[PDB]
Amino acid sequence: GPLGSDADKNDPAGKDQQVNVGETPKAEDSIGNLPDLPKGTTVAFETPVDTATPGDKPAKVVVTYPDGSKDTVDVTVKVVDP
Ligand code: NA
Known part of the structure; x- marks a missing residue:
């Protein structure tokens, strides 16, 4: 069988972030x-x-x-009005 891929061997974890209106995450x-x-x-x-x-x-x-x-990875970007 084949050698596995990088994706097979790694597990990125999503992180929520918060930004202000207009900012670019x-x-x-x-x-x-x-x-x-x-x-x-x-x-x-x-x-x-x-x-x-x-x-x-x-x-x-x-x-x-x-x-x-x-x-x-599914994540949430929370946008707030400052
Ligand atoms: Na993976």
């Missing part, structure tokens, strides 16, 4: 263990996050490992 701030993922792993939001109004915004972080395998 970074996908890195929605992952709680990025140091434990392989060097060279990238993280991105699947879709840009809406921060034009307050609310709990669901988002997905796509975690792409150097071998091309991927994990997703």
